[PDB]
Amino acid sequence: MGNQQCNWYGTLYPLCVTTTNGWGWEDQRSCIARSTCAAQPAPFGIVGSG
Prior knowledge:
Distance between the termini: 8 Å
PDB class: hydrolase
Assembly: monomeric
Number of strands: 4
Order of helices and strands: EEEEH
CATH class: Mainly Beta
Oligomer: monomer
Keywords: hydrolase, beta strands, antiparallel sheets
Entry title: solution structure of type X CBD
Number of helices: 1
Structural class: mainly beta
CATH superfamily: CBM10
CATH topology: Xylanase, Chain A
Strand order of the largest sheet: 1-2
Name: endo-1,4-beta-xylanase
């Protein structure tokens, strides 16, 4: 397991790489596109430990 996360201005969201083309939905929850997920500035960005 090794996916990127979306520290969304504080909250957390799973990244939607297939919907990396904007906001998407997956994992029975809402996923945020790749850059829209993490590409955002700090403290926004890729979350997770690895």
